[PDB]
Amino acid sequence: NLWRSFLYSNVALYLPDSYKITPDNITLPENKNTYAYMNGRVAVPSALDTYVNIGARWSPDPMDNVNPFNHHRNAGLRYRSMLLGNGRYVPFHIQVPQKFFAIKNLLLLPGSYTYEWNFRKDVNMILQSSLGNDLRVDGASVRFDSINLYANFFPMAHNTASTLEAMLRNDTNDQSFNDYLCAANMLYPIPSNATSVPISIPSRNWAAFRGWSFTRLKTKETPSLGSGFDPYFTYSGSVPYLDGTFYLNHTFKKVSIMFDSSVSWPGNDRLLTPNEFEIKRTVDGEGYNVAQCNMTKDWFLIQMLSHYNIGYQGFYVPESYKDRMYSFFRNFQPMSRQVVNTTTYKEYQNVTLPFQHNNSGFVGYMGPTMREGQAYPANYPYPLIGQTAVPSLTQKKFLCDRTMWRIPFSSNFMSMGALTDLGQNMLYANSAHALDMTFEVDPMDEPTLLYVLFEVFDVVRIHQPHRGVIEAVYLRTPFSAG
Amino acid sequence: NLWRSFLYSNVALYLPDSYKITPDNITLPENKNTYAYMNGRVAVPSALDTYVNIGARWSPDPMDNVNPFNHHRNAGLRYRSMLLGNGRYVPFHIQVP
Amino acid sequence: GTFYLNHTFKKVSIMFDSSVSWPGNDRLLTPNEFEIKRTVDGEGYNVAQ
Amino acid sequence: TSVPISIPSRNWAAFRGWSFTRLKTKETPSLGSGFDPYFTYSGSVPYLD
Amino acid sequence: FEVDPMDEPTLLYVLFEVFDVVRIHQPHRGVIEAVYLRTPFSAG
Amino acid sequence: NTTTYKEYQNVTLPFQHNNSGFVGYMGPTMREGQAYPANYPYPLIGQTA
Amino acid sequence: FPLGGSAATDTYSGIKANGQTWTADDNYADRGAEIESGNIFAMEINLAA
Amino acid sequence: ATPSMMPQWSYMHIAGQDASEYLSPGLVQFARATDTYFSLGNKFRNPT
Amino acid sequence: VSFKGGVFSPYLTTRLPAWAGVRQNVMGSNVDGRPVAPANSATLTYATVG
Amino acid sequence: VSFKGGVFSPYLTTRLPAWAGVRQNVMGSNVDGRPVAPANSATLTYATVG
Amino acid sequence: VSFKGGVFSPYLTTRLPAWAGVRQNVMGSNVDGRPVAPANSATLTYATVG
Amino acid sequence: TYFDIRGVLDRGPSFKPYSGTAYNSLAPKTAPNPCEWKDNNKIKVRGQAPFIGTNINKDNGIQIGTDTTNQPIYADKTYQPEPQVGQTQWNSEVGAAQKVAGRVLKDTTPMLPCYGSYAKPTNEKGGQASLITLTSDVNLQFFALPSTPNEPKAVLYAENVSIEAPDTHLVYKPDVAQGTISSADLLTQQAAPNRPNYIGFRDNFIGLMYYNSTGNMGVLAGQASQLNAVVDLQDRNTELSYQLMLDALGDRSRYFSMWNQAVDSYDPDVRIIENHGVEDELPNYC
Amino acid sequence: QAAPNRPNYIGFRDNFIGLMYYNSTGNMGVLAGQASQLNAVVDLQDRNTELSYQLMLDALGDRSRYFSMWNQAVDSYDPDVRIIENHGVEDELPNYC
Amino acid sequence: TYFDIRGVLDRGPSFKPYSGTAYNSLAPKTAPNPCEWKDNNKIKVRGQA
């Protein structure tokens, strides 16, 4: 019984708006993404009640698309949203960091410095709802009172604080540092059951760089980050593009990369299918299934390696200091099933969801209701076990959220520093030639958009030649700004 | 009630024989290692219930010389059967040292 | 040259080599688009009424 | 009626002319895969013939 | 291009005429080395 | 709230109930009373917050 | 739910059809044939709270 | 064609000298004596 | 015109630029709560100023 | 949205790459004879292994 | 296939070349006055010569 | 390197990867099915009655439907009154001019408690009753009150379904002889699920590639010599040796999948039962 | 029948991100000399810097530790609600009032 | 150097942090509060006292 409510009120209540049939005699608002609409959508218990995929580890079919980050048992949201108070009216007093990189770690030398930012007091982006609604339609207006800057000055002694300031104003002593995840993003709109898109950016010097990170995310959950104000931002919760929280990460069918529309990459038949970074094989073949899911051997070899240099010397469990939270390996978990055969079992005759009955006169019919019906035997599932012995066939798809696929721009795909030998191979030439990418992808009901990081060097450099001036000579090679 | 069923699901079973009781007039098999023999045998709750030897973190004495790895909360033996379906006909695909 | 659908533009961007945009290096107030038309006042850029 | 086709820039040294024709979609097996489902038309594919 | 419209979906077959030359040589007995290219559309 | 809020009553521990016929009164005694709506916890949630 | 799923097993004195009126079947044993009426005599826990 | 001869990679410390080498010796002699309490060294882009 | 073979996007996808209007055109909302017109509608061609 | 002038493909056509799934999505067939699901269907996202 | 978000043309637009047939396919007209077939029609694949 | 192995495994008739059952689990462990049971010639039921209808026909149906042009839509025999739909108001008011329904299961079947009960569907729309031939044997079983009889009270249909119990083991079978299932005292008949084991593979695939065997061993050797590089004795426990080498090298607590390695580990609330009693400091009510 | 309204958690976004305009070239800010006024920060439409402080402190420190000031929480759902691993139900004997 | 802000947050009516209710939570989720209704010009009560 308490396992049942752990399946109704935790997973079965999170089906998308195809399911969750509205009950009778209560009318619901039109807007479809308020809380006034998502309160009355009553999920059916008799879909994944307690008997679904029984004794397996299978996430159900419409759980491919919903994140576990709109979740009301989100243990971060258990902590953040109650650190304020349990009520509608909260006089918060919070402290934001300085998280832009190039003036974060920059130690500042003596003078006088005009310093500005600006704060996003629209209410959809400042807040993270769990279930997500039109958070400004319901009316949740945050207002600001008086906004400051606390600063901690180290009490450095005057024999040294006047020595160091005359030391960090040379050319060669200056401050210069990267951005972690040095990259450029290029986010592409792959519309709503489009099974594949092509991609081009034309004809640039690929001077020195390493790695391509790329993932998928729903266009309902992206900002229009260019404009300050943003209309149309319907859903306000657990935005992947900002939170580092990717969950359509596993819905790439086949990925391929072609420089110049002629030459493949890596070429030379290094990988087994060199015109192909196949990533989820949906056919048997002659065996390309790492770890009992459908991830292939050609791509697990360069998604176990590129984070850890595992691979050619054993497929051992990676070290815990290298295994982080946003790593690939910690979240990659396979699955399986035994779905009933629709062909061989001659007595197979499927039952539509209003007519499947377990706990026949011990449940409600449609939605959680009182006692009705009569005690009686069951229909679904067909028993996969034992003397009954229905013929079966398996299913082998995975999900690896929370991280990004990475293709290191290398010869042997090895992370061997900032540069790569094949990264700085093009400076030995002078080519500046284009690429095309085509991403075969899982079709979906929602318009969805495709994210690409060209993980390209992002280096700033500052020095203060006098008391008060500060100049910031930037560089990004390639994908520059001038 | 819930801690009562915790003992019987987990620890009041896995007792060696002459402690389980064959019920009335069922046709249990004869081989000690067949599933259907250790299936139909039913252990008594009163021998190891929520009242016995409370206050001591005691491995109970006939259970002491039993595997704790035949036990079904074996999270590295429970894991690998979840990893390979939930039924009879399983077409595996494995990688061996 | 008698063009009369010329006011129907809303915003215009421009980029070189898919990465660097132009005029570049933050010349204009909003540099990575040329907002020929702004249908929301907000802070208010509606010059010449 | 029309299809525009572009390839990006490169050197154009030592290439002869062109060849272009038209093929029904069923008449062209996607050759790069090992096995190719959806390929039904067993009807003397001009892509290979 | 401009093609005549048809109900059945048809795909087009642009085929360039870039050279595609191969050269082999072998120094010793149980060896072969094939050094080759096609220019343009080279594999580098 | 206490000061600005209008109808704030001073209900205390003997005069305070939800689950009115469902929880025992003043201890883990067996439960008594009848069913009746709650009074004490002010909602802080909804239109009546 | 009660022990057995039995609420009020009233004897419904079995009968077999015949044209426009019917009576007196052989094999129904009229003093015993008991079913329920409505649903199961069910009572409720909120075992989560 | 060397990474080192490209000037904007030594000017940005993409490829070039480690932090113990391109800084003036008056700074590294200070930086290894105050790293216990006033840590500077996450600012200088050790190039790999 | 009348695809009938549902392989979709054979066409080169250019990135969506960063502003409001090229992402969706669902029934949006202003910052206090009244709904704003979609970009399909010709209502949003004049500066509605309250 | 609502073309009404039937000049079609003004858009730059990128080549279809060589694999199964970017050519059509008609009701295909496995090598012994049962039909395989089209690429439009969400059935073909898990490895059906008999 | 089934856009439902009406942001349109994310695809790279190539210029229309200069001839008749890539601009529209409305019911045109010959120089004396009889109507000519649209380019959608398969009538305009043979040289109609009066 | 590794070895890639493909094949099809049977898992035995004793797989059971879950405790409890998936077939009428929330139903009590003791409550019986709504069956008949057979006398020398007579019948006795214990069933129940959802789906309060309005007007029985002669031998057609129950009149649930109400169309416009006087079309009383009746009940299909193999199909409805369906066992999971009924009264939702707790004022049934049954005993008025309205009449009641059900599906009481016939005695060609065996009999079983409601817990762990199952019968395969025989028609796609929900279809309980099994066929003989196309006649799925469902008759118009009628009943009528003692107070004013022969105006009937409950038509409720009969089935000869294939009843099977995929996980029960029949604790308390009563004292009924051979060849009599669905007897009088056979109603009692509680059940309990089977003990869940797990027919998985072995940890780290130890034993699949058998080491430490004098003879019937394997050889790494070049073709130019066939001088073997493996010498396998009897006493060198190499199967064990790679296990707990990964303890001395890496993490045991992490569940890897491609090697299929995951530690055979108990729960410290199982081997060591730290017994503390229960939290019942207040009473808990229905 | 009163079923409860379903709960959500209105809270501040983790690491307070989105509360300062980043990469909105035009809505940026500047650290600049009081006498010199020149931009010591220019910004781009690309070059995500919310995926570069968040996800940066994942490398140096950890993130599974909760935190007060900057509300640096986790987003960790537990791994048995996305990937449900059912035991069936934990009963082997009755249970009742 | 970190900023701080302060002010008032409004959160909307749609907060409800806790799952389930806190108002008469131990009730059976079908039972009514003791009330009545107008029959025609007349009230019959369903209460308990």
Q: A249: exposed, middle or buried (C-beta count within 10 Å: 0-12, 13-18, 19+)? A: buried
DSSP A238-252: --HHHHT--SSTT-E
* φ, ψ (nearest 5 deg) of residue A113: -135, 115
From chain B, the residues in CB contact with A337 under 8 A are 85-86
Tokens in use for A150? 């606390």
Provide the pairing of β-strand E15-18 with E21-25.
unpaired
* Tokens 């800057």 -> residue: A149
Q: Do residues A153 and A259 touch, judged by C-beta distance below 8 A? A: no
DSSP conformational letter for I15: P
C24: three-class secondary structure by DSSP: coil
- Strands in L124-238 per DSSP E: 131-132, 135-136, 163-164
CA distances from N46 to A47, A73, N35, N37, N49 (A): 37, 40, 6, 9, 10
Q: Is A102 left (phi over 0), alpha (psi -120 to 50) or beta?
A: alpha
Tokens in use for L110? 């065996």
Max Cα-Cα span within chain I: 49
- Strands in chain C per DSSP E: 15-16, 20-21
* φ, ψ (nearest 5 deg) of residue A37: -100, -35
Query: In angstroms, rounded to a whole number, what is the distance separating the alpha carbons of residues B62 and B17?
Result: 10
Query: In angstroms, rounded to a whole number, what is the distance separating the alpha carbons of residues A408 and A406?
Result: 6
Query: In angstroms, rounded to a whole number, what is the distance separating the alpha carbons of residues A168 and D39?
Result: 69
* Tokens 């002869």 -> residue: D16
Query: In angstroms, rounded to a whole number, what is the distance separating the alpha carbons of residues A296 and A294?
Result: 6
Query: In angstroms, rounded to a whole number, what is the distance separating the alpha carbons of residues A239 and A254?
Result: 25
The Cβ of residue I16 has, within 10 Å, a number of other Cβ atoms equal to 19
H helix or E strand, kind and range, residue B78: helix B78-82
Query: In angstroms, rounded to a whole number, what is the distance separating the alpha carbons of residues L105 and L141?
Result: 11
Tokens in use for G25? 């079947």
* Tokens 């789906």 -> residue: L51
Query: In angstroms, rounded to a whole number, what is the distance separating the alpha carbons of residues I36 and I22?
Result: 15
| Contacts by residues B34-38 (CB-CB < 8 Å, ≥ 24 positions apart) | B35/L12, B35/L13, B35/L14, B35/L197, B36/L14, B38/L195
Q: Name the residue among A479, A419, A459, A481 with its Cα closest to residue A182.
A: A459
DSSP conformational letter for L241: H
Provide the shortest C-alpha distance from residue F41 to chain N (in Å). Answer: 8
Tokens in use for A401? 């959220």
Query: In angstroms, rounded to a whole number, what is the distance separating the alpha carbons of residues L274 and B11?
Result: 12
Tokens in use for N10? 């409004």
* φ, ψ (nearest 5 deg) of residue L239: -55, -45
Query: In angstroms, rounded to a whole number, what is the distance separating the alpha carbons of residues A480 and A58?
Result: 46
Q: Do residues I44 and I35 touch, judged by C-beta distance below 8 A? A: no
- Torsion angle defined by CA atoms of residues A202, A207, A212 and A214, in that order, rounded to the nearest 10 degrees: -40
Q: Do residues D25 and E9 touch, judged by C-beta distance below 8 A? A: yes
Tokens in use for L34? 């709504």
Q: Do residues A252 and A213 touch, judged by C-beta distance below 8 A? A: no
Chains that touch E (3 or more CB pairs under 8 A): A, D, I, J, K
DSSP K16-41: PPSSTTSS--S--B-SSSPBPPPTTS
Q: Which residues contact B96 (CB under 8 A, 6 or more apart)?
A: L2, L3, L4, L5, L205, L208, L209
Report CB contact under 8 Å: A201, C20.
no
Q: Do residues A234 and A220 touch, judged by C-beta distance below 8 A? A: yes
Using omega within 30 degrees of 0 as the cis cutoff, is the peptide bond preceding A266 cis? yes
H helix or E strand, kind and range, residue M42: none
Q: Is C13 left (phi over 0), alpha (psi -120 to 50) or beta?
A: beta
Q: Do residues M44 and A475 touch, judged by C-beta distance below 8 A? A: no
Tokens in use for A171? 């050319």
Interface test with C, best of I13, I19, I43, I48 (most C CBs within 10 A): I19
DSSP A124-180: HHHEE-SS---TTTS----EE---EEE-------TTTHHHHTTTTTSSTT-EEE--S
Q: Do residues B96 and L5 touch, judged by C-beta distance below 8 A? A: yes
- Torsion angle defined by CA atoms of residues A172, A178, A183 and A185, in that order, rounded to the nearest 10 degrees: -100
Cα angle A173-A175-A178, degrees, rounded to a multiple of 5: 140
Tokens in use for D16? 């002869």
From chain F, the residues in CB contact with A86 under 8 A are 44-45
Query: In angstroms, rounded to a whole number, what is the distance separating the alpha carbons of residues A260 and A257?
Result: 10
Query: In angstroms, rounded to a whole number, what is the distance separating the alpha carbons of residues K40 and J28?
Result: 30
From chain A, the residues in CB contact with G47 under 8 A are 1-2
Query: Nearest CB to B87: which of A57, A287, A392?
Result: A392
Q: Name the residue among A242, A186, A181 with its Cα closest to residue A214.
A: A186
Query: In angstroms, rounded to a whole number, what is the distance separating the alpha carbons of residues M71 and M16?
Result: 7
Length of chain E: 44
H helix or E strand, kind and range, residue A196: strand A196-201
Q: A459: exposed, middle or buried (C-beta count within 10 Å: 0-12, 13-18, 19+)? A: buried
Provide the shortest C-alpha distance from residue G45 to chain N (in Å). Answer: 7
Tokens in use for B15? 């007792």
Q: Is A268 left (phi over 0), alpha (psi -120 to 50) or beta?
A: left
* Tokens 């590089």 -> residue: L229
Query: In angstroms, rounded to a whole number, what is the distance separating the alpha carbons of residues A117 and L128?
Result: 70
Chains that touch I (3 or more CB pairs under 8 A): A, C, E, J, K, M
Query: In angstroms, rounded to a whole number, what is the distance separating the alpha carbons of residues L246 and L237?
Result: 15
Q: Do residues H22 and H28 touch, judged by C-beta distance below 8 A? A: no
For residue A300, what are the β-bridge partners?
none
Rounded to a whole number of angstroms, the distance between the first and last alpha carbons of chain E is 30
Chains that touch L (3 or more CB pairs under 8 A): A, B, F, G, M
Chains N and A physically touch (3 or more Cβ atom pairs below 8 Å): yes
F49: three-class secondary structure by DSSP: coil
Query: In angstroms, rounded to a whole number, what is the distance separating the alpha carbons of residues A193 and A226?
Result: 27
Q: Do residues A222 and A187 touch, judged by C-beta distance below 8 A? A: yes
From chain C, the residues in CB contact with I47 under 8 A are 38-41, 46
Q: Name the residue among F36, A12, L89, A238 with its Cα closest to residue M6.
A: A12
Q: Do residues B77 and B71 touch, judged by C-beta distance below 8 A? A: no
Query: In angstroms, rounded to a whole number, what is the distance separating the alpha carbons of residues A57 and A335?
Result: 6
Q: Which amino acid is at F9?
A: Q
Tokens in use for L26? 């929330």
DSSP B5-40: HHHHHHTSSS--TTSEE--TT----S-TTSHHHHHH
Provide the pairing of β-strand G34-35 with B57-58.
unpaired
From chain H, the residues in CB contact with A175 under 8 A are 43-44
The Cβ of residue J43 has, within 10 Å, a number of other Cβ atoms equal to 13
Q: Which residues contact M65 (CB under 8 A, 6 or more apart)?
A: none
Radius of gyration of chain E from its Cα atoms, rounded to whole angstroms: 20
Q: Which residues contact C40 (CB under 8 A, 6 or more apart)?
A: A229, A231, I47
Q: Name the residue among J38, J46, J32, J42 with its Cα closest to residue J20.
A: J38
Cα dihedral across residues L228, L232, L236, L241: positive or negative: positive
Query: In angstroms, rounded to a whole number, what is the distance separating the alpha carbons of residues A339 and G19?
Result: 51
Interface test with A, best of L5, L84, L194, L252 (most A CBs within 10 A): L84
Q: Which amino acid is at L241?
A: S
Work out how many CB contacts closer than 8 A connect G with N. 13
Q: Which amino acid is at A29?
A: P
Report CB contact under 8 Å: N21, M4.
yes
Helix, strand, coil % (nearest 5) of chain C?
0, 10, 90
Q: Do residues A6 and M84 touch, judged by C-beta distance below 8 A? A: no
Q: Do residues E17 and D16 touch, judged by C-beta distance below 8 A? A: yes
Q: Where are the alpha helices (DSSP H) in chain L?
A: 238-242, 245-249
Query: Nearest CB to L257: which of A292, A376, A378?
Result: A292
L37: three-class secondary structure by DSSP: strand
H helix or E strand, kind and range, residue H9: helix H7-10
Q: Name the residue among A379, A51, A375 with its Cα closest to residue L164.
A: A379
Rounded to a whole number of angstroms, the distance between the first and last alpha carbons of chain L is 62
Closest alpha carbon within chain D to J32: D37
Q: Do residues A366 and A356 touch, judged by C-beta distance below 8 A? A: no
The separation between CA G47 and the C-alpha centre of its own chain, rounded to angstroms, equals 30
Provide the pairing of β-strand A277-278 with L118-119.
unpaired
Provide the pairing of β-strand A127-128 with A405-407.
unpaired
* φ, ψ (nearest 5 deg) of residue A38: -80, -5
* Tokens 């700074």 -> residue: H27
Query: In angstroms, rounded to a whole number, what is the distance separating the alpha carbons of residues E28 and N10?
Result: 83
Using omega within 30 degrees of 0 as the cis cutoff, is the peptide bond preceding A189 cis? no
Chains that touch N (3 or more CB pairs under 8 A): A, F, G, M
Tokens in use for A216? 């998928």
* Tokens 């397996």 -> residue: A56
H helix or E strand, kind and range, residue A3: helix A2-8
Q: Do residues B81 and L273 touch, judged by C-beta distance below 8 A? A: no
Report CB contact under 8 Å: J10, K14.
yes
Length of chain L: 286
Cα dihedral across residues D22, D24, D27, D28: positive or negative: positive
Q: Do residues A195 and K2 touch, judged by C-beta distance below 8 A? A: no
- Strands in A357-442 per DSSP E: 392-393, 405-407, 435-441
Chains K and M physically touch (3 or more Cβ atom pairs below 8 Å): no
Q: Do residues A379 and L129 touch, judged by C-beta distance below 8 A? A: no
Chains F and H physically touch (3 or more Cβ atom pairs below 8 Å): no
* Tokens 């072995």 -> residue: L202
Tokens in use for L268? 């410290």
Report CB contact under 8 Å: D32, A276.
yes
Max Cα-Cα span within chain N: 73
Q: Name the residue among L24, A287, L167 with its Cα closest to residue B86.
A: L167
Query: Nearest CB to M2: which of N2, N16, N29?
Result: N29
Q: Do residues A345 and A351 touch, judged by C-beta distance below 8 A? A: no
Closest alpha carbon within chain A to B35: A386
DSSP conformational letter for A292: T
Cα angle A183-A185-A189, degrees, rounded to a multiple of 5: 160
The Cβ of residue L129 has, within 10 Å, a number of other Cβ atoms equal to 25
Which residues of G, range 9-28, sit inside 8 Å of A by Cβ?
none
Query: In angstroms, rounded to a whole number, what is the distance separating the alpha carbons of residues D48 and G26?
Result: 81
Query: In angstroms, rounded to a whole number, what is the distance separating the alpha carbons of residues L105 and L158?
Result: 5
Q: Do residues M64 and M76 touch, judged by C-beta distance below 8 A? A: yes
DSSP L196-212: P------GGG-SSS--S
* Tokens 């009572």 -> residue: G43
Query: In angstroms, rounded to a whole number, what is the distance separating the alpha carbons of residues B6 and K28?
Result: 84
Report CB contact under 8 Å: A150, N1.
yes
- Torsion angle defined by CA atoms of residues A221, A226, A230 and A235, in that order, rounded to the nearest 10 degrees: 0
CA distances from L157 to H3, L83, L98, L119 (A): 87, 11, 18, 16
